[PDB]
Amino acid sequence: IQLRSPKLSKDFKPTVIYEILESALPPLTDDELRHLSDTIESMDQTQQQ
């Protein structure tokens, strides 16, 4: 979709390309963060309680 979007035809310098590439990289699926975040949130909640 980005490839197709017309900003390519229009904008001509590199820093657009860097943002595009950085967006191309695959991120952290919610599961991997989910275990850590759930445990830490529960632990800090216990501390607050």
Partner: protein
């Protein structure tokens, strides 16, 4: 329930005594480290790919 302040004070004493035995900061750090370590290995795998 509606109880007299003596009962509530005694109940809170016993509860705080029990609740305080559940956890310790050292175990918090240990658990956090071991999970964070496996997450770190996962991040390593993502960086390598």
């Amino acid at each position: 329930q509606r109880v007299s302040p003596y009962f509530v004070f005694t109940s809170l004493e016993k509860e705080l005594e029990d609740q305080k035995g559940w956890l310790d900061e050292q175990d918090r750090q240990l658990y956090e480290d071991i999970i964070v370590n496996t997450v770190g290995v996962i991040l390593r795998n993502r960086i390598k790919r």
